[PDB]
């Protein structure tokens, strides 16, 4: 489909499950708002001393901590 | 005759005939309705 | 050295293994376990090369003659030098 000059007809499956897992650990990029990606969550309202640093690391696109994924992945 | 029928009914003739029928179906369906990546 | 050639009690005495053997490893000896009243024997396994022609020939449901390859000698390696 890309050879014939029509790359818009690609079957591109979004890896929704791994993105959702990333969200559960705090990755807000996808907007799933589940567990550590939701401030109201009981999993995130614990006062865990690691949570601010873990979120700050996992939500900056400057490292290899849960690299953003797409149909290629 | 019966031998010609038994030959035209052999496995390669029948499998190529069915493959041709299915290819015609798919090619024509994509001719009149192309680019169906998914259902609306 | 040599390979090991065993003959089991499912032998029907058809002798096809002896005819297949290209090195005269096998013989037919009298027996009473089958109708043919004969069983295959391997009295010269020191000449056996292990080409498995006997096993190819055996008709019984899984072979009644079995060749287990063992220690390699110049006779068993089919060497002419």
């Amino acid at each position: 489909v890309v050879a014939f000059g029509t790359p818009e007809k690609q079957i591109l499956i979004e890896p929704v499950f791994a993105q959702w897992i990333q969200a559960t650990s705090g990755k807000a990029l996808y907007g799933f708002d589940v567990l550590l990606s939701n401030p109201d969550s009981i999993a995130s309202t614990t006062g865990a001393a690691w949570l601010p640093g873990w979120l700050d690391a996992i939500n900056s696109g400057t490292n290899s901590l849960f690299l953003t994924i797409g149909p290629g992945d | 005759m019966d031998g010609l029928k038994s030959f035209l009914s052999t496995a390669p003739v029948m499998i190529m005939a069915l493959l041709t029928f299915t290819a015609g179906i798919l090619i024509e369906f994509n001719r009149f309705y192309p680019d169906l990546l998914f259902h609306p | 050295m040599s390979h090991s050639v065993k003959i089991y009690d499912t032998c029907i005495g058809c002798t096809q293994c002896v005819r297949a053997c290209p090195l005269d490893v096998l013989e037919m000896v009298p027996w009473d376990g089958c109708k043919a009243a004969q069983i295959a024997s391997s009295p010269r396994t020191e000449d056996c090369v292990g080409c498995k022609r006997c096993e190819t020939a055996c008709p019984t449901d899984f072979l009644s003659i079995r060749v287990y390859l063992g220690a390699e000698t110049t006779r068993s390696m089919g060497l002419a030098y």
């Binding site: 890309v2 050879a3 014939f4 000059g5 007809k9 | 031998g3 029928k5 | 056996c48 080409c51 068993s76």
Partner: protein
């Protein structure tokens, strides 16, 4: 009792059976009839594969040499029918689906195109703009050039050729049916080798080139002379108008005024107007001179017609081939050729091996001759056409050669009689095959070390920053001195050793740089250290292929390991794990390995050709005359290392195939990936073994039994020999398709 003609014996050596095989359709409905082992019934899926493997094995089907000969004759007829259908389809697509007339009107500013893709699922992008508003796939077969050389002008002539090709195919088909079922020639008829040879040299080759010389003089040459002058194809009279108006022939060639009298009175010189010997190329079109080719075909007709008289048939004069064979025997060869006439008249595989060898060699010769002496108009301008035809004829020749080795081995297994071969050539070669094969092995090792080893030395020296220690024209030179000397002799031939030749036979040996349009048609092809190394690589690979195949033939009967191999047959997997393991001892397996090695050799040959022509030949000439080659003359310094071939040849020139997406050449990149895939796929069959696959089939069959879907024809893993056949077939297909895509994309992208 079908259609019975009178007789047609003509009081000749004809002897036929009136109706041995009756016509019926029932054996069509019984697949496997020709083999006793298959007529019973398929119990395992192996029966299926065998049904295709023994289809043409007529020897294993029947013991009557006469029936085998009749089968082969009728199958030859059916094969000619298939080829006639193919050629007629070519002419039909050129007639009704090609821009042949638009191309003829302006060949320089247009590209040869046939086959229009149907616009669907986006494949309509494959209809690239070839010129004059025409959109299609560009063809590299060079059909348009052969057609312009023949004298074609209208699509209706090509359509008539296509209709005639269909009719000729029907003729060949009916002839095969009639000569196998009705009048079937006896065995005694095929064994007249003197008669057959006289006819083939005189009637097939001689009369063929005679008739084609007639057509070239009457149709090709005048139309091509009018095309080269620019009279335009719509204004040139039809070919028959030159026969109906001999004044029109005299106005183009005044020699036609004097009539046939110079021929009958041996006054041939006045025929200089159309019987010429110029030598070089046409300045307007870059091809060979059609008058030179007409004179050539005329002399070839003369030579072949004369040669068709040496052998004796019914009238006493001639030669007995058995006599000539039996006469030749010396102090080194005992009885020489005593017994060869008998095996070359009762064994089909012997003739087949000889003929495959010579035909493959001849096709390689055809590639190497047609590239440097472009016989067709505007052929050398199209580097894609040139490269494509070259590599195609190369591959065909190599395959025919591998088949020659195969059928030599088959003859040895099936038709060898030791009583009929006592102390002759065959006997003594079998008696010193150890000497032969050991020396060929040593030559192969010496060639591998002294060709590829030079490349490895150069890679290591260059990597270490030691260019002065390399093998190259600028360091340790390895000059192809003898080839350079022969090139120089060729250059000086016209006017000296070739007085009546105006120009050199091929400008690849030297001379001016003949250029048509913006591109260079042909120019001298210099030879240096890199050429030396590549040529010795060619020598090495050809010698290794010959080693494998010759060993396969010479030991197909026996070896020190397997002394009774002749009883095992031509084609068998092994003779056990014993004796250390005896895998691939058969002649068939030697053919199997020789296939890979011929692929290796020919891949290197075509890579050498492509790179050398892109570096030191093809290019653009300026109005000043400056030649800018396709890849800027990079061969001499890059083709001396393997990294040079990986970077400047493969990696560099692969840029067109990979970026072909979204363009008309995208199918080439697709087939590129496809060839890579099939090559990788073959490695599963070649690297594994039947036992694993059968055991896996066991569990899959158990799962079928669980749901009661097990088939009555039990699934069996591919046989050992079949595993290898699948492996080699897919290896060759994948690799050749990869390089087909690579070559076509690269050559079409460089304009």
């Amino acid at each position: 009792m079908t259609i019975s003609p009178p007789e047609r014996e003509a009081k000749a050596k004809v002897s036929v059976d009136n109706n041995p095989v009756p016509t019926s359709f029932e054996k069509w409905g019984k697949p496997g009839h020709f083999d006793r082992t298959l007529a019973r019934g398929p119990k395992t899926t192996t029966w299926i594969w065998n049904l295709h493997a023994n289809a043409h094995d007529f020897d294993s089907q029947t013991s009557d040499l006469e029936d085998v000969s009749r089968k082969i004759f009728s199958a030859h007829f059916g094969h000619l029918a298939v080829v006639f259908v193919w050629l007629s389809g070519m002419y039909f697509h050129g007639a009704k689906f090609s821009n042949y007339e638009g191309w003829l009107a302006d060949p320089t500013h247009i590209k040869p195109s046939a086959q229009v893709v149907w616009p669907i699922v986006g494949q309509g992008i494959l209809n690239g703009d070839v010129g004059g508003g025409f959109h299609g796939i560009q063809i590299t077969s060079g059909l348009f050039y052969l057609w312009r050389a023949s004298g074609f002008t209208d699509s209706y002539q090509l359509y008539c050729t296509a209709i005639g090709g269909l009719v000729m195919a029907a003729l060949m088909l009916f002839a095969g049916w009639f000569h196998y079922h009705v009048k079937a020639p006896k065995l005694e008829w095929f064994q007249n080798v003197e008669s057959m040879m006289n006819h083939h040299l005189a009637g097939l080759l001689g009369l063929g080139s005679l008739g084609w010389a007639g057509h070239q003089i009457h149709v090709s040459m005048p139309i091509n002379k009018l095309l080269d002058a620019g009279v335009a194809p719509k204004d040139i009279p039809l070919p028959h108008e030159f026969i109906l108006e001999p004044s029109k022939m005299a106005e183009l060639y005044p020699s036609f005024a004097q009539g046939l009298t110079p021929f009958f009175t041996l006054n041939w010189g006045v025929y200089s107007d159309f019987l010429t010997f110029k030598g070089g190329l046409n300045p307007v079109t870059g091809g060979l001179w059609l008058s030179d080719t007409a004179h050539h075909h005329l002399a070839i007709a003369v030579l072949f017609i004369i040669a068709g008289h040496m052998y004796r048939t019914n009238w006493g004069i001639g030669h007995s081939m058995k006599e000539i064979l039996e006469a030749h025997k010396g102090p080194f060869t005992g009885e020489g050729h005593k017994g060869l006439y008998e095996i070359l008249t009762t064994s089909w595989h012997a003739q087949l091996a000889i003929n495959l060898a010579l035909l493959g060699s001849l096709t390689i010769i055809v590639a190497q001759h047609m590239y440097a002496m472009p016989p067709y108009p505007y052929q050398a301008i199209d580097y894609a056409t040139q490269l494509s035809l070259f590599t195609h004829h190369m591959w065909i020749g190599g395959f025919l050669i591998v088949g020659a080795g195969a059928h030599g081995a088959i003859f040895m297994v099936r038709d060898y009689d030791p009583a009929k071969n006592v102390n002759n050539l065959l006997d003594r070669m079998l008696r010193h095959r150890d000497a032969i094969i050991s020396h060929l092995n040593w030559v192969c090792i010496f060639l591998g070390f002294h060709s590829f080893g030079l490349y490895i030395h150069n890679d290591t020296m260059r990597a270490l920053g030691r260019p002065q220690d390399m093998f190259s024209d600028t360091a340790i030179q390895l000059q192809p001195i003898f080839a350079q000397w022969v090139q120089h002799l060729h250059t000086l031939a016209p006017g000296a050793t070739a007085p009546n030749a105006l120009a050199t036979a091929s400008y690849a040996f030297g001379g001016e740089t003949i250029a048509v349009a913006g591109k260079v048609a042909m120019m001298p092809i210099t030879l240096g250290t890199a050429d030396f190394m590549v040529h010795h690589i060619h020598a090495f690979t050809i010698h290794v292929t010959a080693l494998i195949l010759l060993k396969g033939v010479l030991y197909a009967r026996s070896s020190r390991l397997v002394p009774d191999k002749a009883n095992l047959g031509f084609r068998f997997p092994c003779d056990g794990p014993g004796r250390g393991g005896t895998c691939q001892v058969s002649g068939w397996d030697h053919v199997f390995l020789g296939l890979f090695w011929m692929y290796n050799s020919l891949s290197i040959v075509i890579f050498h050709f492509s790179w050398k022509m892109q570096s030191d030949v093809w290019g653009t000439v300026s109005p000043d005359g400056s030649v800018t080659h396709v890849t800027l003359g990079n061969f001499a310094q890059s083709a001396i290392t393997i990294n040079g071939w990986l970077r400047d040849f493969l990696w560099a020139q692969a840029a067109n195939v990979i970026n072909s997406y979204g363009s008309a050449l995208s199918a080439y990149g697709i087939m590129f990936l496809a060839g890579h895939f099939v090559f990788a796929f073959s490695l599963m069959f070649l690297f594994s073994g039947r036992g694993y696959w059968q055991e896996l089939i066991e569990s899959i069959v158990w799962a079928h039994n669980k749901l009661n879907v097990a088939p009555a024809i039990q699934p069996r893993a591919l046989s050992i020999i079949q595993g290898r056949a699948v492996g080699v077939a897919h290896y060759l297909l994948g690799g050749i398709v990869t390089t087909w895509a690579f070559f076509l994309a690269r050559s079409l992208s460089i304009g």
